[PDB]
Structure formats: C-alpha cells, structure tokens
C-alpha cells in the first residue's frame, strides 16, 4: 500500500498530463492524492516541455491503483488499445476535486469499445461524463446509481456508438450476466 501525488499536486504541478517523463513515478502505487490526466499530448509528446512521447505499454503501470482522491480525465488513449485496461483494478474515485468543478470521471473522444472498469464500485462525489467515444458500447447497461454518493450526481453519457448499433452488431451483456450491467462483452464484465 502507497499513496502518491497525482498530476497537479506536488512536483507534478505545472504538468498537463501523465507522460513519459513522469509515468514511471507511479510504479507500484495504490491511492492517488490528486487527479489523473491523460491528454493528447501524452502520446504526441511535447518539444516545449522537453517531453518524449509515451510508450502506451507504460500505462500498464497504472494497474495497481485502487483509489483516486481527485478526478479521472481520459481525453486521449491508444488508438488500438480498445479498453481502459490499465484501470481494471480501480475501485474508487473520490472527486474531492472535479473537472470544471463537476466531473470526477471523464472519458471523452476515445476509441474504446468497452469501458472495462471492472473493479470501480464508488464515485464519492462528482459527475460522470462519457462523450464522443465513437465506438463505445455497454455504458448504458449498468446502474450508475449503485456507484453514487448523492442525489446530486449525474451522468452525461452522450454521443457514443448509439445503443442500436450495439444490439445490432451484437454488443450487449454476455448471457452469463445478472442483468445489472456490463463494462464490456466477456463474463468478467457483469456490473
């Protein structure tokens, strides 16, 4: 067990995203005091900030992170990686700080087809934004409420691979599932 400064907090201030330069400083981490930001710039790399592009293999380092005290913001993510694998073991977001003061989970404009946050059992505060993920399915099938701390919590889960094409291309809850929800196709995704 170990709690690490996130992006923004501590020396990781002044730094827009998780990236090559800092990523390694998350090795064997448990809780994250702060926010997680994965921006376009993490994969493009930046000349201005003296920063090499990220080997999207190094996202596998996030695998041990159970708690995020602030918020999660994934705007970019490996075009061929189809899932949010790295965050499989992520169990809880506090939302103690929030994107625009509102959003504790932000999954925008990604190539994901499943979300795959299989261990996520609690968003303590803040709302969920799931936008523009052209091929994402399965998000609807879950009961977000079961993940929530107040009435005041919302889901702006708009503008993805319309639920129709899902059932059409057969992208719905695998049969084994106790109809409460899906994070993806296979049995290891029943909410």
């Amino acid at each position, epitope marked *: 067990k170990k709690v690490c400064n996130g992006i923004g907090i501590g020396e990781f201030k002044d730094s827009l995203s998780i990236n090559a330069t800092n990523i390694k400083h998350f090795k064997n981490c448990t809780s994250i005091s702060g926010d997680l930001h994965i921006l376009p710039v993490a994969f493009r790399g930046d000349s201005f900030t003296h920063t090499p592009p990220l080997d999207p293999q190094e996202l596998d380092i996030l695998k041990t992170v159970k708690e995020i005290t602030g918020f999660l913001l994934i705007q970019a993510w490996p075009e061929n990686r189809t899932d949010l694998h790295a965050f499989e073991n992520l169990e809880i977001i506090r939302g103690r700080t929030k994107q625009h003061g509102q959003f504790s989970l932000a999954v925008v404009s990604l190539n994901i087809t499943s979300l795959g946050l299989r261990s996520l059992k609690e968003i303590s505060d803040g709302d969920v934004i799931i936008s523009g993920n052209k091929n994402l399915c399965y998000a609807n099938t879950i*009961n977000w409420k079961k993940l929530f701390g*107040t*009435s005041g*919590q*919302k889901t*702006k889960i708009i503008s993805n691979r319309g639920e129709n094409s899902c059932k059409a291309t057969g992208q719905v809850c695998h049969a084994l599932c106790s109809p409460e929800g899906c994070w993806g196709p296979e049995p290891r995704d029943c909410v």
Partner: antibody
Amino acid sequence: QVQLVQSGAEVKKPGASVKVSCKASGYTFTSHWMHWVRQAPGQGLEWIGEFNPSNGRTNYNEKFKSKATMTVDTSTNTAYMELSSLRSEDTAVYYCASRDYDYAGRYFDYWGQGTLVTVSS
Amino acid sequence: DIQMTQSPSSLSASVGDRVTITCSASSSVTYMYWYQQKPGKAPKLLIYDTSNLASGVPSRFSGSGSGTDYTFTISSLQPEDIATYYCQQWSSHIFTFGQGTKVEIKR
C-alpha cells in the same frame, strides 16, 4: 403509476421509538434515492436525509444523525425511517419522497401522503 | 452549512398578477429547487436547477437568479395557485429548505 403509500399515523409517549414505512409502487425501486422530510404542524419543511436503496449509502442532515435511522427492504419495495429518543418536538408529518436525477439528466420527484406522528403523554 | 433566507412570509395579490418570491443563500449553492405545497396536500416540485420547469407545470411559473440570489415568479397568478411555496438548495451532499411564503389570493 408512481405512488408512495406511507404507513398510518400513530401516537407515542416521549422516549419511545417509531418505524414509519413507505411502500413505493409504480417504478423500478433500486433506481432512485429515497428521502425523508419532516413537517412540524403549521410550519415549514426540514430535510432529514436520503437513502440510495441500491447500494445502501446514506446522507443525513446534521440535526437528525442521532434521532433518525434510514433503512430499506428491496425485496418488498419499501423504505423505513426510525426515530430514537422521542421528544415532544418530533410531532410532525413525516413525508418520504423519491428524489433523484434521471439518466436522461432530467429531475425525478415523487412524494408520500406523509405519516403523522404525535408525541404526547 | 448553507443557510436560506426566503422572503416574504406572506403575499396577497389579485388573479393575473405577478408573484415574485426571492430566496437568498448564505454561502454559494450548486442546485436550487422550487416546491409548491397546497393546503393538506404534499409538496410539489415546480422548478429544478434554477429555471427548469418540472414536467407538466404551466408557463406562468419560472425561477431565475444566479450566485446566492434566486427568484421564483408566477407571471400571471391563477386561483389554483394558492399554496405555500418553498425553495430548497442542494450543496455538498446536504439539502436545505427555506421558510416558506404563503401566497394568498385577493378577490
């Protein structure tokens, strides 16, 4: 469709308890947070707290943490609200109300007929 | 932790008249609701979020204001509008009600 049928009124001597029931008909129960609002007679509304009948999480208003306790029985679509150390000041209409935000983003809002509780000797 | 000052206590006005009920706030407030309680019936949500007219509610009802200042308005008071109206705020996990405003019709 959506209905909240709350238990009948009752009278209690100070010190006693009371478990006020609320049978939620007409919607998918485990889906909406259940609230309890108190109304002292001839008087305004005071919020006691909310219950997420799906996961069991709870949010009380300062004053009521000690007095009230919120519980649910999903098996029979019914939410309860039990009052401790009953005082002459607990005499009021107890309303339950399913208040929430729709997946649609819109607000969700339905109320019981309220259950009168008289504390007297 | 947030403390509401609703005003006025009572209000008499004629049919067709404009009824405006302010409801002020101590610190700042995320979400603002407006409820209507007709005698002997339970509360009824008319407006949520500040201005979003709940479903079914007629046009004459509205609610505005930003910051710590919220107004509720019945542009054209109808007889069936007799009730006491309450605002509530939701901020940082707890709800808080205003004191009420008895609206009464002059005839």
